[PDB]
């Protein structure tokens, strides 16, 4: 039987006013004898109609996959607003309804610390610049690296992990060429999360 | 029915004092066909040493059966490659799953310890950081040690894929700032197959 999955917006989309948060309803395992499927949407049990359904898209396994995208008037998701996707199909006895909302509970602010490379690491041609982001909730976050204001490309970030206190932390490692680090270049870790003032913060880091 | 094959735990394959297991989980076994049968292959030679637990009903009223096979520890380290075959009368042909250690030149970890940033001591608890980077394959184990007794209150990120094809992770130890200030020596200990004696420690104190 056909199955339904409901996906949240991306953290960045809800944090920037310059970006469109979307909620996505995916129907897989749609069969060939009855291609047609509903989409009906509810933000808090009141029916909306702003949703965009794409045409059904055949798959390797010879089942269909249908996607419906609802764009959220950004402040709603960010407010704990609750979103419901409901799908029925001639191959379904009764419709399937799935619900999604922002993680429920008290937002806790992240804490941003930058760490110089270890004194050993300078025997290497590239040193690691570290940003520790800890104490935050919910897990949704965005972290980027910047130098002189302009972006920085050569960084990687861990997935959010659960600390024993019930909150999350991650680390961000930016790899720079040791010369760039030693010449007194100032590097900057930038983190976005809803519990921050202005939804935003930096911490700087230099020799 | 769906089938999932899980590797042994890194620790267990790294220390001789521990036994590595390979685990085959079958979910969505229905009540019309409670029967599930398992075939195991160590590099295409069928084995029969495996332990099947009796099936155990789940909250959703499907069954879940798990079969556990034990590895001649060096075998997982020697890249022996494992195949689970699941037969069930609701499936026309079996489901077969395979798993092994990542192949390619093993690269040694590089272990750096980092003091907490000072903006952090406004807290009663400060974080001590261990960067393990440059390692390959991803199977690894990290612990925190002080005075020989372990440290319980640490967390470690999953290994992340770096651009050069090697892995890194971080390990965070939380101690009471009083502990950090008294000159207590804290120890980051990592095990990984490219290390000498499969082992190295890296210590750090104010």
């Amino acid at each position, epitope marked *: 039987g056909p199955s339904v999955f409901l996906f949240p917006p991306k953290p960045k989309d809800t944090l920037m006013i310059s970006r469109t948060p979307e909620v996505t309803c995916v129907v897989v395992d749609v069969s060939h004898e009855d291609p047609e499927v509903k989409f009906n949407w509810y933000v808090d049990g009141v029916e909306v109609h702003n949703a965009k359904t794409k045409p059904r898209e055949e798959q390797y396994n010879s089942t269909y996959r249908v996607v419906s995208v609802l764009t959220v008037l950004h402040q709603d998701w960010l407010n704990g607003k609750e979103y419901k996707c409901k799908v029925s199909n001639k191959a379904l*006895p*009764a419709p399937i309804e799935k619900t999604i909302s922002k993680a429920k509970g008290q937002p806790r602010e992240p804490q941003v610390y930058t760490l110089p490379p270890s004194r050993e690491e300078m025997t290497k041609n590239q040193v690691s610049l570290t940003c520790l982001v800890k104490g935050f909730y919910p897990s949704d976050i965005a972290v980027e690296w910047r130098s002189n204001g302009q972006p920085e490309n050569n960084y990687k970030t861990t997935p959010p992990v659960l600390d024993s206190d019930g909150s999350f932390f991650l680390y961000s490692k930016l790899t720079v060429d040791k010369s760039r680090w030693q010449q007194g270049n100032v590097f900057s870790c930038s983190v976005m999360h809803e519990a921050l003032h202005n939804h935003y913060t930096q911490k700087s880091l230099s020799l | 029915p769906s089938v999932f094959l899980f590797p042994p735990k890194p620790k267990d394959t790294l220390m001789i004092s521990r036994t590595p297991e390979v685990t085959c989980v079958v979910v969505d076994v*229905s*009540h*019309e066909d409670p029967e599930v049968k398992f075939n195991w292959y160590v590099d295409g030679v069928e084995v029969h040493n495996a332990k099947t637990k009796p099936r155990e*009903e*789940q*909250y*959703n*009223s499907t069954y879940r059966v798990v079969s556990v096979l034990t590895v001649l520890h060096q075998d997982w380290l020697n890249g022996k490659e494992y195949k689970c075959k699941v037969s069930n009368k609701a499936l026309p042909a079996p489901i077969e799953k395979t798993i092994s250690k990542a192949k390619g030149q093993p690269r040694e970890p590089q272990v750096y310890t980092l003091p907490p940033s000072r903006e952090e001591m406004t807290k009663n608890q400060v974080s001590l950081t261990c960067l393990v980077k440059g390692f390959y394959p991803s199977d690894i184990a990290v612990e925190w040690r002080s005075n020989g007794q372990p440290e319980n209150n640490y967390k470690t990120t999953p290994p992340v894929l770096d651009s050069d094809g090697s892995f890194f992770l971080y390990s965070k130890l939380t101690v009471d700032k009083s502990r950090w200030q008294q000159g207590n020596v804290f120890s980051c200990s990592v095990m990984h197959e490219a290390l000498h004696n499969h082992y190295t420690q890296k210590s750090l104190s104010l």
Partner: nanobody
Amino acid sequence: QVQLQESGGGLVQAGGSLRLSCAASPGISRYKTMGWYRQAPGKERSFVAAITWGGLTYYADSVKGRFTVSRDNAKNTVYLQMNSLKPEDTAVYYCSVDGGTRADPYHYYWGQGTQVTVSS
């Protein structure tokens, strides 16, 4: 269509007993978990009990030891036996056909609800 028609509600004083039962339309409950949920005014609907097709039972801590869920698989009806009823147990009780996990369930169908109120 599928129905889940419940019965046996009413009023009892504290420490009494009552047997809720909930009949399923044919087929719909077969091989699936049947659960009980109850809702007090000013609170959410909340979990009470559930029994798998194979007879495994799960209880909310609030009610362990005092309620007993059971099932007649052949007639498509599930039962909740309430003992040591305390004033906190006042609510509408809805029966369900359930999937997913115990910590994170999925609710296929709901019955239309019975009131059970225990006066002090």
